[PDB]
Amino acid sequence: ATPAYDLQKRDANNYLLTVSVPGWKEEELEIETVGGNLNITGKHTEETVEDQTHWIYRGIRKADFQLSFSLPEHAKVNNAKLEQGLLLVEIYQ
Amino acid sequence: ATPAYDLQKRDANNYLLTVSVPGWKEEELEIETVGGNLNITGKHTEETVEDQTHWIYRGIRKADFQLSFSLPEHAKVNNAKLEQGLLLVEIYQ
C-alpha cells in the first residue's frame, strides 16, 4: 500500500507533487534528490507497545513507503511543505 | 468511498475517534450530536474549474461523506481537533 498522490503541471517548467500522508510527522519523512531521481521516503517510527484491548477498530493503516520520480535535467525541488496530511513538493525547471 | 477511521477506548468511560481526512479544511467538516448519534459530515467545497491539462495524474480522491456513531447515554463530545490530516474526536461518558 503506497500513498496516493497527484501530479500537476502549473506550467511547462513547473510541477507540483502532492502525496497523501495523513498522520505522518515531519521527522518520518525524507526527500532527497539522488542521481537525477527525487525520492520521497516515509519511515514510520520505532514501534510502540499497543494494547489491543484499547483498539476497538483500526481502519487507518500506516506503512513505510518510497516514491521515486525522475527529474528532468535540470530540475530542482524548491520546497516540500507538510500541511493537512498532504506533502506538497514543488519541482522547478 | 468513506474515510478510514480508528476507534479507541482510552478507558471504560472514554473513546477516541480518529478519522483520516487528508486535504480537508475545517470549514468543510462538521460534527453534531443529534438524537443520541454523533454525525461527522464532510462536504467538499463548491466546485472549482480544473484544467485537465494541468493534471498529469490524480490519485487523490476527495468525496463528501457522513459517518454516524451512536453515543452511549450519557456521552458527550469534548473536542474535535483537526491535525495532520486527521480528525480526532474525544468522546467522554
Author numbering:
A (entry chain A), B (entry chain A): 40 to 132
Text lifted from the article:
Most sHSPs exist as large oligomers which undergo drastic rearrangement or dissociation into dimers upon activation during stress, in order to execute their chaperone function. Aggregation Suppressing Protein A (AgsA), an sHSP from the pathogenic bacterium Salmonella enterica has been reported to form dynamic oligomers. In line with the current understanding of sHSP structure and function, our results show that in vivo, the wild type protein exists in an equilibrium between two oligomeric states: 18-mer and 24-mer.
The core ACD fragment of AgsA:His-DD crystallized as a symmetric dimer in the space group P41212. Mass spectrometry of the crystals revealed that the full length protein (size 17.1 kDa, 150 amino acids) had degraded in the crystallization condition to a fragment with mass 12.7 kDa, which corresponds to residues 35–147. Continuous electron density could be traced for residues 40–132, and the monomer adopts an α-crystallin-like fold, with residues 83–103 forming a long loop which separates two β-sheets. Residues 93–98 of this loop in subunit 1, form part of a β-sheet in subunit 2. In the AgsA:His-DD dimer, this groove is occupied by the dimerization loop of a subunit belonging to a neighbouring dimer. The hydrophobic cleft is known to be a substrate binding site15 and the binding of the eight residue stretch from the dimerization loop may represent the interaction between a sHSP and its substrate. Unlike all other non-metazoan sHSP dimers which form 3–4 intra-dimer salt bridges, there are no salt bridges between the two subunits of the AgsA ACD dimer. Structural and sequence alignments reveal that in AgsA, the equivalent residues to Arginine and Glutamate are Leu106 and Gly98, respectively. Leu106 of subunit 1 makes no contact with the dimerization loop of subunit 2, whereas Gly98 of subunit 1 participates in the formation of two hydrogen bonds, one each with Tyr44 and Asp45 on the β2 strand of subunit 2.
